[PDB]
Amino acid sequence: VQLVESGGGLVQAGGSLRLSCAASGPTLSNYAVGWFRQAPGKEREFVAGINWSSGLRYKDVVKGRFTVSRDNVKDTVYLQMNSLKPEDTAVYYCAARFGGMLPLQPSGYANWGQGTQVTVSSHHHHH
Amino acid sequence: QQPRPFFMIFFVELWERFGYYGVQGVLAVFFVKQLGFSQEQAFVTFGAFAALVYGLISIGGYVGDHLLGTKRTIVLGALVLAIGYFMTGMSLLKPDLIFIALGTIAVGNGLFKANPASLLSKCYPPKDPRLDGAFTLFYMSINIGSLIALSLAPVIADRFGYSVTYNLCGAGLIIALLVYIACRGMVKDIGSEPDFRPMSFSKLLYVLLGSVVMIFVCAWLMHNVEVANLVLIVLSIVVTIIFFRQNKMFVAFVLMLEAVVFYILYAQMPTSLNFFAINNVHHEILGFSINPVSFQALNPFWVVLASPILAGILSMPMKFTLGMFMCSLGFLTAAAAGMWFADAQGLTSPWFIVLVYLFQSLGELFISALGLAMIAALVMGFILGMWFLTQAAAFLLGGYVATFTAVPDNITDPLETLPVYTNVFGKIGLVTLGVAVVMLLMVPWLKRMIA
Ligand SMILES: CCCCCCCCCCCCO[C@@H]1O[C@H](CO)[C@@H](O[C@H]2O[C@H](CO)[C@@H](O)[C@H](O)[C@H]2O)[C@H](O)[C@H]1O
Ligand SMILES: CCCCCCCCCCCC
Ligand SMILES: CCCCCCCCCC
Ligand SMILES: CCCCCCCC
Ligand SMILES: CCCCCC
């Protein structure tokens, strides 16, 4: 019923970060966990998720870069973010809905984390 | 208002039904998530489980009437039931146990179910005016236990796991037994004839042996639902042939076939309508998030509110016909909600499901609450057995019907699942409308035969 997100932070373009979502009470195993993100001045949008039986869903613009996966021992869900780009900069949320569906809008999910800032800088080393 | 033994029977029945519906509400989800069954397997396995639970009811009535006594068979049934619930909780340690545990629940119900009602019948002198009210309150007891179990058991299983849920089902049975034992003195002059002679240990062993054999047979049939279909088809032809050899029976037969359609639809609440709620309904009502599996509690909920009211307010075939029209409307409402009133993300308001369950529960109050009680007016033990057998066949058929809504575990988009549910529910509602119309057309002839 309450999810804790961890693992945000600051990274340079092309780098990687891992987000994790854990639930205090309810076993997360029964839940589809979707990752949403809100960039400055826009609405929360679906990024990626895994349902209660290992089915996966992805936003087009993150396919081949983000992977959602689940550790059912630790009751934890992960979002592995590789090849990060400046426009992946946002506040990231995990959200949980009972069952096998990953609806696209925030209203499909009852339980929400508090949000973690992910920032991707155009920084690269000097040539 | 009622004799004192009524209150004991009320609470024994409540706690036994609490245990049962604690299992029924979570069983299909348990099959899918815990045992890894596909949704098709879970649905047909639930159909077989429910078929066995209801089909054996004739045996426990025979055991209570003629072998051991009503009060003894209440105690034995309650003990076998509690053992079954605890065996189910243990099945999480030893998964190979699951079918045996479910067979033990099935046989337990078969020993138990007929006997509290039988006992309640004996608490009133035979033309006591309070009888009708007593049975409406008995049904409300069944549905209060079911309401609590269907509300809370999915929450409990989510928060603490299935072993705790099943152990609490067992505990509910234990406290049914404790309430019986504490109130034993209230029914000292109440029972069938064997209750008042010393117990025959010969007959007690015949019943324990037959029970164990039946437990293994049930486990096998639930594991192999294909032969279960075969067995029931053969059994049905044989019973129909015997029935036809032995014009009020023709009316009992036709009302029984209509009841079959009703039980096929009832079988959808724990299977296809449950996963419809999981997959295509908002899990929030009046601002509260809820476990969508708990939506099954809307059935006893509406029964609890509507049974007193509907007790306050034609005759048999028309009441049956009305119930069939209500059931048709429940499934047409489900279909319409999905076809026209869903979100852009594919989700429907849970108020449509509140209404679906209202329609289905009114159908229940018209058909099955008021069925074999008044099939007994056209006939007796044989037809009682036939009713239970046909209702078991109906649950097997219902599981099969539910498989048309099964969703693969990799689907994640509600807009892919919504058209499957709406197609199946709309066709169920249309077929049921046709059945209701044929029922309506036959009401005058049927009502003539009762003359
Ligand atoms: C329509 C039938 C309604 C059933 C009535 C539910 C009985 C009340 C539950 C016990 C007390 C409430 O305890 C809790 O409350 C929160 C918000 O209220 C609910 O919701 C929370 O838990 C459930 C399952 O554990 C999750 O599916 C749900 O998405 C989560 O947000 C649950 O229902 C209940 O776990
Ligand atoms: C009321 C007397 C209690 C009788 C209990 C006897 C149980 C016999 C066990 C037989 C094992 C198959
Ligand atoms: C190897 C798993 C076998 C499980 C059998 C469970 C039997 C328990 C009897 C009470
Ligand atoms: C009133 C006691 C009933 C005894 C039945 C128990 C058989 C195991
Ligand atoms: C009794 C009707 C059975 C239909 C099976 C396909």
Structure description:
- Chain B: This is Dipeptide and tripeptide permease B.
- Chain B: Proton-dependent permease that transports di- and tripeptides. Has a clear preference for dipeptides and tripeptides composed of L-amino acids, and discriminates dipeptides on the basis of the position of charges within the substrate.
- Chain B: It is found in: Cell inner membrane.
- The structure holds 2 chains of a larger assembly.
- Chain A is mainly β.
- Chain A has a single domain, classed as Immunoglobulins (Immunoglobulin-like).
- Helix content of chain A is about 0%, strand content about 50%.
- Chain A has strands at about 5, 10, 15-25, 30-40, 45-50, 55-60, 65-70, 75-80, 90-100, 110, 115-120.
- Chain A is globular.
- Chain B is mainly α and about 450 residues long.
- Chain B contains 18 helices and 2 strands.
- Helices cover about 75% and strands about 0% of the residues of chain B.
- Chain B is globular.
- In chain B, strands 1-2 form a two-stranded antiparallel ribbon.
- Chain B has one domain.
- The chains are: A mainly beta (about 130), B mainly alpha (about 450).
- Dodecyl-beta-D-maltoside sits at the interface of chains B and A.
Question: What's the arrangement of secondary structure elements?
Answer:
The structure holds 2 chains of a larger assembly.
Chain A: E1 3-6, E2 9-12, E3 17-23, E4 31-38, E5 45-50, E6 56-58, E7 66-71, E8 76-81, E9 90-98, E10 111-112, E11 116-121
Parallel strand pairs in A: 2-11
Antiparallel strand pairs in A: 1-3, 3-8, 4-5, 4-9, 5-6, 7-8, 9-10, 9-11
Chain B: H1 4-34, H2 39-55, H3 57-67, H4 70-90, H5 98-112, H6 114-121, H7 131-160, H8 162-182, H9 201-223, H10 225-245, H11 248-266, H12 272-280, E1 284-285, E2 288-289, H13 298-312, H14 315-340, H15 350-366, H16 372-375, H17 381-402, H18 414-449
Antiparallel strand pairs in B: 1-2
Dodecane is lined by residues 199, 208 of chain B.
Function (chain B): Proton-dependent permease that transports di- and tripeptides. Has a clear preference for dipeptides and tripeptides composed of L-amino acids, and discriminates dipeptides on the basis of the position of charges within the substrate.
GO molecular function, one term (chain B): dipeptide transmembrane transporter activity
Keywords (chain B): Cell inner membrane, Cell membrane, Membrane, Peptide transport, Protein transport, Transmembrane, Transmembrane helix, Transport
